[PDB]
Design a protein around this ligand. Structure first.
Ligand SMILES: CC1(C)CCN(c2ccc(O)c(C(=O)c3ccc(C(=O)N[C@@H]4CCCNC[C@H]4NC(=O)c4ccncc4)cc3)c2)CC1
Lengths: 20, 339
């Protein structure tokens, strides 16, 4: 399921901003 | 509708006066008891503090000047405080004081005790459409306000939306918002929330905030964002592909809104057309939304956080504490003169 895919992604925690 | 125009003109007058003559040095570290870390960032942390003269609690951001200079972020951090001290809107966190010492920059703002939306969303899994809509409406009005001042936020996500005592949102962390009339070019934002024109190294405008609203609404209603993968590079591929799938439980109205917010062609994206924000406000998914009542905070909130009196931090998670160190030598004085 898409939910299962989300958990598998490792990106369920707080996400940081990015830059160059 | 002329009433909106009048309100925005006065709001711009108020903002510009503060923007052009920013307040400086309105408190000192020794006036606050530091209690608990509520969150962290690249150069420091936000702590619950108590103003000792009054007993009032606030949230204080502390930034290490030398760390800011190391990562080459003088301009963004100066701008963050300049914006915070200038804006005034029901869903933007309110700055109370700011100051600096030999080591650090400090911003003392309203303490928003309900915790981060991130917390509540991950705990419940997903929000009902009415619950998501309640929060989305607040962000629509906030972007109408910010965009009228030529401010692109660039970092919408549940992590930055705090829930207050009444269950309404307060937006935080203006750490790379930019005041520009037209376009800008920097790669900035959080991977899952980046519009395709950012990723593709094109010029972009305030329409990136409307793309990000599409991402937020999707995440609130589904419990996971429209584009995710193990690594940012793979997320970016999904975003630029223009392909979004919706859960079976999404309403037809919600799907139609999202297709127009998550529109890859920025010249066709809702919020960026001739009628601007009104294409969103008048969309069928918002038909039950009383926009004036949301602004006035007169709509009953779907979720009212537990609060046990002043200084209660039970809705926040736990972070490793560090005592604030203040050097006997001034660090980076010239660089931060304006703060
Ligand atoms: C990607 C970059 C190149 C450019 C942007 N950078 C940047 C810019 C400005 C900054 O102030 C910083 C920071 O160091 C910084 C330092 C501390 C925090 C911070 O702790 N923020 C918390 C936690 C993060 C998620 N947002 C919620 C926020 N909490 C609150 O603001 C809050 C306010 C009132 N009541 C309760 C909480 C956020 C950012 C970092 C970092 C690097």
């Amino acid at each position: 399921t898409t939910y299962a895919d989300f958990i598998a992604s490792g990106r369920t925690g707080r996400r940081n901003a990015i830059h160059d | 509708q002329e009433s909106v125009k009048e309100f925005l003109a006065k709001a711009k007058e108020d903002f510009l006066k503060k923007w052009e003559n920013p307040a400086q040095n309105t408190a000192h570290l020794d006036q606050f008891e530091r209690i608990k870390t509520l969150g962290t960032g690249s150069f420091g942390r936000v702590m619950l503090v108590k103003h000792m003269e009054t007993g009032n609690h606030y949230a204080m951001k502390i930034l290490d000047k030398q760390k800011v200079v190391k990562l080459k972020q003088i301009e963004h951090t100066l701008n963050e405080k300049r914006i915070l001290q200038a804006v005034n809107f029901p869903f933007l966190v309110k700055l109370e004081f700011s100051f600096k010492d030999n080591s650090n920059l400090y911003m003392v703002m309203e303490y928003v005790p309900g915790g981060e939306m991130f917390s509540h969303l991950r705990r419940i899994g997903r929000f009902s459409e009415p619950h998501a809509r309640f929060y989305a409406a607040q962000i629509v009005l906030t972007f109408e306000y910010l965009h009228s001042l030529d401010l692109i936020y660039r970092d919408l996500k549940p992590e930055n939306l705090l829930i207050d005592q009444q269950g309404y949102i307060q937006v935080t962390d203006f750490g790379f918002a930019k005041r520009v009339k037209g376009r800008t070019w920097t790669l900035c934002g959080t991977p899952e929330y980046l519009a395709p024109e950012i990723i593709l190294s094109k010029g972009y405008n305030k329409a990136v905030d409307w793309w990000a609203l599409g991402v937020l609404i999707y995440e609130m209603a589904a419990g996971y964002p429209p584009f995710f993968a193990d690594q940012p590079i793979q997320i970016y591929e999904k975003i630029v592909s223009g392909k979004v799938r919706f859960p079976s439980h999404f309403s037809s109205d919600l799907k139609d809104l999202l297709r127009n917010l998550l529109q890859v062609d920025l010249t066709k994206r809702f919020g960026n057309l001739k009628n601007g924000v009104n294409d969103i406000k008048n969309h069928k998914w918002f038909a039950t939304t009383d926009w004036i009542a949301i602004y006035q905070r007169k709509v009953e909130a779907p979720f009212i956080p537990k609060f046990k009196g002043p200084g209660d931090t039970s809705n926040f998670d736990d972070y490793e504490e560090e005592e604030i160190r203040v050097s006997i030598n001034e660090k980076c004085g010239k660089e931060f003169s304006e703060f």
